[PDB]
Design a protein around this nucleic acid. Sequence first.
RNA 1: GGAC
Length: 212
Amino acid sequence: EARKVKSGIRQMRLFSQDECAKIEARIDEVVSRAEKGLYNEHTVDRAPLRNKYFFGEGYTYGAQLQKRGPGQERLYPPGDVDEIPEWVHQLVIQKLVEHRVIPEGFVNSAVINDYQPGGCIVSHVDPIHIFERPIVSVSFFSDSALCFGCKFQFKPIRVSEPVLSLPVRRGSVTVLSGYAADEITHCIRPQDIKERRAVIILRKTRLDAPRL
RNA sequence: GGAC
Ligand SMILES: [Mn+2]
């Protein structure tokens, strides 16, 4: 299963320090605008140590699901979340298309996940009924790891030993497909977030993805 | 400090 996950992982260094510093400033400006109430309601998802910023297409998850279950996550109504920022197209998405990571016109969803030290996201599969593959992630502000096949326990939070631990370094691009994207959860453990880390996740929603 |  660890070997199976490996076949679906593409990881490469793509962004330089100056490019990360420019984007990390754009991330800091996204956080500032969200704190000023200048984004649409569903653009900003707030949790104690993690903030999610949905552009282009957002999704419901977790406790926002009244009926929890496989296939229950939903996209928001059309045109609800804010459009992908121009700086995301030029700085992040044009670099990925020019380096053949994804086709042009693939990405219609750009989500920025912002983690404070000790933050996490519990094990999950990116909803197969919502998102097409592959899943592209670009990390910022610090180095961390992406873990697979972890079982979470709570009160207090405990995370089982990962099937695979993948270091995700600042400026590196992580791509998930196949088994690593479909047949096993991925997560972030609190111990792996030692400083603030942000990741811009570029995805393609399916033509049949249900909306709220 | 909680997406399976
Ligand atoms: Mn995910």
